[PDB]
Amino acid sequence: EKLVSKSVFPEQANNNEWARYLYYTGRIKAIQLEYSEARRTMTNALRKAPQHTAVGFKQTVHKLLIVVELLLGEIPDRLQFRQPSLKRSLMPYFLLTQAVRTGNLAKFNQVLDQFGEKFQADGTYTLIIRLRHNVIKTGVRMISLSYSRISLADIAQKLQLDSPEDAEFIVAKAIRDGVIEASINHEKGYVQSKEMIDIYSTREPQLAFHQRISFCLDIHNMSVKAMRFPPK
Amino acid sequence: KILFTEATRILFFNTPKKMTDYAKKRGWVLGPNNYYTTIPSTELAKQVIEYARQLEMIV
Amino acid sequence: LLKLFTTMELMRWSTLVEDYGMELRKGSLESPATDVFGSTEEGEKRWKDLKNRVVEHNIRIMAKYYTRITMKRMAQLLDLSVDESEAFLSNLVVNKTIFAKVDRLAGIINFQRPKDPNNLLNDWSQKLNSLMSLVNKTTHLIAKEEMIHNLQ
Amino acid sequence: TRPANHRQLTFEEIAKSAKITVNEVELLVMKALSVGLVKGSIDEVDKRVHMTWVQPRVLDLQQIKGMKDRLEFWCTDVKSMEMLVEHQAHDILT
Amino acid sequence: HLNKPSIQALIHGLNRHYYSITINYRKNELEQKMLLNLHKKSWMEGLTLQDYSEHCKHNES
Amino acid sequence: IISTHLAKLYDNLLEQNLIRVIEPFSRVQIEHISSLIKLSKADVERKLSQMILDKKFHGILDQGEGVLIIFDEPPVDKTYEAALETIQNMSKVVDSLYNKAKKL
Amino acid sequence: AVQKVVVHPLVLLSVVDHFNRIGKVGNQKRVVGVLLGSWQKKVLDVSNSFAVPFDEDDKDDSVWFLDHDYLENMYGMFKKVNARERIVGWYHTGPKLHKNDIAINELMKRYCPNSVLVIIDVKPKDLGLPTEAYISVEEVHDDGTPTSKTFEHVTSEIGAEEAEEVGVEHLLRDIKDTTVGTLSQRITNQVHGLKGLNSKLLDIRSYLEKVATGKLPINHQIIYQLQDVFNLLPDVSLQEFVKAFYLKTNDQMVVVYLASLIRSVVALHNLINNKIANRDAEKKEG
């Protein structure tokens, strides 16, 4: 990680080496707890990953993006658990994801006891420890996405927290991070989420479009510079 | 806004005086009843001027 | 009375009677009571008709020179209950002569459809090139005051 | 008095200032529009009046100086943005 | 000899009864700058926005 | 053939009554419109829900307080309609360019 | 009377020629002549002009000469040449109006009742002042003021008909023109508009400086039009205008995604074709 921070990767480097560097820095910041940038980088690398070859590469990248996502609360898409070249290889991680989405500590414990060798084999046993300890945050994430407001007693009932104060503490920790946007009203008990203001007339589309058009302009300029006429 | 009593309860400062000192140590204040944009038109203008620049000045 | 019903400004029904009612419903010594506003059945029909005509003249003059009026407040500004005033404004709007749209708590009387972005930036750009009356302003400040510049 | 920073004037201001009842502010505004001095509008719901009026007055040489300063502020804003766009587009202006 | 005589003039006696003298236009900078005002729009349309509705219709087309 | 036809006519005339009125209003209580139209709350609620669901009358129903809201959908969206379809058009162009790259 | 006065790019050249031919020795700095043209009770267009022998003396600005029979004779000659143009007004250089302007206008009102002063600025051609046309009006000074004349400004345009504008173009055709508006030229136009706005700002500020300290009298209609114009300024606040973000981002749709992505794809397509073409050229050559 320290070497990465003081080393700037060349932009002209070939696609596969760029994908390798992206994978390496993504693993570094995933075990370094920079989960958002981690998932962004592995999604980029998979976009740069070869479609046909690099089966082992795509398998490791898929495994680490799965764990990074569900650590952040995001559920990996089922289709990546369906291609023949990845199905049985992610079958341990597929059962992992099944336990994570179900969230039952019994099946979770049985899955851990059955696949811990695979979990450490990728250097993710500590990662799956944090996974086992972030499944609750994931649960709170879908709870808050579904409900605009919810009493902490209802939180404890739907999440099996056994205490309103425990629910308060856990939801406060979860809302500290950028997982849930809300406005807690302890006068009455509201978890009233922020008003979903119109994305248009909010300058956000302007910024996203500015970034995208800058990307297209750089692509066009680099293309027009790379015409490379021959001498004869 | 968070009430004096519940704040003292959840701030884990068993001495209410300790809770008050830790409250003054921060800017998070007691409250009266014990109950604790524009069009910048410059950076975006720079952006559109930059777009025009990338259209002009040849390759 | 014809002035208050033709020129602008709100038609206060209460002072309308207190100023012309010894003269509409009753017969003046100078001129006897009109056969349109007597105690006859047609007289009282026209009487309530004008009690709604103050409503419509009010509505028209506010359409040119108001933006919004509240249902309780305009009801007492025409001295009726809410429901019949709503019904009469409905009759004024349905035949396509008055813009209005009524809420249970707002009862705004305007179509300000509210100025769309295209139209409101059109108005702003107009006022901006109407601000280009600044060019007339400066050319006049130099011309009409240049016959002063040579006069010092 | 209020330089359009808060155009919406609550009926309390017109009532206390003009020494009138809030029932009559609307009437006098309507009269002023009718004669041709102001061209504003009335919001009874929130008890506010919007004013866009075209009646000027004599201007009290100290007020001439104040409006001179306002002109200076807006002209230096114009100048500053002109230099900004010129510097940013110097590549294209040629 | 920079410019070529035309067939029409040539048939009508050019280079047989009369010669075409090269024509040069004396145009100093002052007259050029004054003629430039014929299409110098103004300081206003450089700040006058095009109609937004017409802008949207043009963009849609 | 007369029960069905007259039921259809009754529904249609109910629709015509509900559009010929409420034109003055932009936000009117269902109680007001029902009392002016002489139906039960539930039946008129179902009829208004059907009317909006059929997109016969633009609006939306806030039963959380029990009110009908009215608005219009601006047709400027045609530019985005062109935009997205042109986007996947250029996507197919890019696919053909990808094939041309496979040639290289 | 006239809501617009059109000055052809021929009377401009006539005034320049007159000013030059005089200022060879004629350091009067201001020369007066007669401008003809088709006369309309609508927009007025000046199609031609001639120079009368005008003399002015700096003493008291009241002794001057204008040979009027020369005026009549030249107008007769122009009638013989083209009877269509009629005496319309007059011109003089020296953009600062002198004292004899109104007196000369009264002198020339007999040959045409609606005589208009048309000043031609010769040397100062910085931003926006090709000409200024004035007409005398019969009002003392205002509702409650003593007598004056007070030439009235009329909006002026520089417009040409066919077979005159082509001469202008042929006289032009330097690196100038480019009637089609490229992005570069449009941004340059915006910069020029800002510059003109600032110059007008400095002019009005200068007059207000001259009035505020009492050197120049307070002119009531001037002050009134001021109060109007600073009343007329818009407000970028009042967050309903600010919802112009709607149309700004709507524009960003057509500029950012459509044309820019299409241009990028087109450039890439041009790239790959060259890369095949270069590859094919190499193969034709091991």
Swiss-Prot record, chain A:
Limits of the PCI domain: 19-198
Residue numbers bearing the Phosphoserine modification: S151, S163
Coiled coil: none
Signal sequence range: none
General function of this protein: Component of the 26S proteasome, a multiprotein complex involved in the ATP-dependent degradation of ubiquitinated proteins. This complex plays a key role in the maintenance of protein homeostasis by removing misfolded or damaged proteins, which could impair cellular functions, and by removing proteins whose functions are no longer required. Therefore, the proteasome participates in numerous cellular processes, including cell cycle progression, apoptosis, or DNA damage repair.
Subunit annotation: Component of the 19S proteasome regulatory particle complex. The 26S proteasome consists of a 20S core particle (CP) and two 19S regulatory subunits (RP). The regulatory particle is made of a lid composed of 9 subunits including PSMD3, a base containing 6 ATPases and few additional components. Interacts with UBQLN1 (via ubiquitin-like domain). Interacts with ERCC6.
Assigned protein family: Belongs to the proteasome subunit S3 family.
Name of the protein this chain belongs to: 26S proteasome non-ATPase regulatory subunit 3
Gene name in the database record: PSMD3
Full-protein interval shown: 268 to 499 of 534
Swiss-Prot record, chain C:
Top-rank lineage group of the source organism: Eukaryota
Modified residues (N6-acetyllysine): K64
Domain PCI, residue spans: 1-116
Protein family: Belongs to the proteasome subunit p55 family.
Associated pathology: Stankiewicz-Isidor syndrome: A neurodevelopmental disorder characterized by delayed psychomotor development, intellectual disability, behavioral disorders, mild dysmorphism, ophthalmologic anomalies, feeding difficulties, deafness, and variable congenital malformations of the cardiac and/or urogenital systems.
Function description: Component of the 26S proteasome, a multiprotein complex involved in the ATP-dependent degradation of ubiquitinated proteins. This complex plays a key role in the maintenance of protein homeostasis by removing misfolded or damaged proteins, which could impair cellular functions, and by removing proteins whose functions are no longer required. Therefore, the proteasome participates in numerous cellular processes, including cell cycle progression, apoptosis, or DNA damage repair.
Quaternary data: Component of the 19S proteasome regulatory particle complex. The 26S proteasome consists of a 20S core particle (CP) and two 19S regulatory subunits (RP). The regulatory particle is made of a lid composed of 9 subunits including PSMD12, a base containing 6 ATPases and few additional components. Interacts with ERCC6.
Protein name as annotated: 26S proteasome non-ATPase regulatory subunit 12
Taxonomic source organism: Homo sapiens (Human)
Gene this chain is encoded by: PSMD12
UniProtKB/Swiss-Prot annotation, chain D:
Residues that bear N6-acetyllysine: K16
Coiled-coil positions: none
Domain of life: Eukaryota
Physiological role: Component of the 26S proteasome, a multiprotein complex involved in the ATP-dependent degradation of ubiquitinated proteins. This complex plays a key role in the maintenance of protein homeostasis by removing misfolded or damaged proteins, which could impair cellular functions, and by removing proteins whose functions are no longer required. Therefore, the proteasome participates in numerous cellular processes, including cell cycle progression, apoptosis, or DNA damage repair.
Subunit structure: Component of the 19S proteasome regulatory particle complex. The 26S proteasome consists of a 20S core particle (CP) and two 19S regulatory subunits (RP). The regulatory particle is made of a lid composed of 9 subunits including PSMD13, a base containing 6 ATPases and few additional components.
Family: Belongs to the proteasome subunit S11 family.
Protein name per its UniProtKB record: 26S proteasome non-ATPase regulatory subunit 13
Lineage: Eukaryota, Metazoa, Chordata, Craniata, Vertebrata
Gene from which this protein is expressed: PSMD13
Included stretch of the parent chain: 283 to 376 of 376
Swiss-Prot record, chain E:
Phosphoserine: residues bearing it: S42
Highest taxon of the lineage: Eukaryota
Tissue specificity of this protein: Widely expressed. Highest levels in heart and skeletal muscle.
Family: Belongs to the peptidase M67A family. PSMD14 subfamily.
Subunit structure: Component of the 19S proteasome regulatory particle complex. The 26S proteasome consists of a 20S core particle (CP) and two 19S regulatory subunits (RP). The regulatory particle is made of a lid composed of 9 subunits including PSMD4, a base containing 6 ATPases and few additional components. Within the complex, PSMD4 interacts with subunit PSMD7 through their respective MPN domain. Interacts with TXNL1.
Function of the protein: Component of the 26S proteasome, a multiprotein complex involved in the ATP-dependent degradation of ubiquitinated proteins. This complex plays a key role in the maintenance of protein homeostasis by removing misfolded or damaged proteins, which could impair cellular functions, and by removing proteins whose functions are no longer required. Therefore, the proteasome participates in numerous cellular processes, including cell cycle progression, apoptosis, or DNA damage repair.
Protein name (database record): 26S proteasome non-ATPase regulatory subunit 14
Protein source organism: Homo sapiens (Human)
Lineage, uppermost ranks: Eukaryota, Metazoa, Chordata, Craniata, Vertebrata
Gene behind this protein: PSMD14
